[PDB]
Amino acid sequence: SEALRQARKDAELTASADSVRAYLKQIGKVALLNAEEEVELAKRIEAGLYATQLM
DNA sequence: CGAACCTGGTCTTGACTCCATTGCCGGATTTGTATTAGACTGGCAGGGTTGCCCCGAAGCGGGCG
Numbered sequence: 001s002e003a004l005r006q007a008r009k010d011a012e013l014t015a016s017a018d019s020v021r022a023y024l025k026q027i028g029k030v031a032l033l034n035a036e037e038e039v040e041l042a043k044r045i046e047a048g049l050y051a052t053q054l055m
Numbered sequence: 056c057g058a059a060c061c062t063g064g065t066c067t068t069g070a071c072t073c074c075a076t077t078g079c080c081g082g083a084t085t086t087g088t089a090t091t092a093g094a095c096t097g098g099c100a101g102g103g104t105t106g107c108c109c110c111g112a113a114g115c116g117g118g119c120g
Contacts, residue, residue: 024097032096 033041 018099024089028097
């Protein structure tokens with residue numbers, strides 16, 4: 001149904017005084033990774049650092 | 056009245072000496088930074104009370120047809 005959808009949409013778009021709730025809503029966007037993605041990203045980091053050292 | 060003296064601050068000099076002032080050096084202690092490789096991935100005061108001000112339905116009366 002869409003009644004629970006509009007209920008969750010109305011309850012999710014509520015403003016409060018807690019900044020930590022906004023921070024958790026902020027950090028809840030990007031999903032977690034796996035070890036091969038971590039290896040690939042660290043490869044990219046070290047390669048970019050060697051490239052800017054070459055620069 | 057003239058001479059010798061006693062004692063007043065007054066002041067120099069030679070010697071002693073004593074304690075602050077750096078100063079170095081060695082060590083003790085004290086404070087500041089870097090590092091720990093299994094994996095671990097989204098919380099909690101909190102409401103309740105009292106009083107006053109700002110926007111929305113609603114009669115509703117006047118303009119409209």
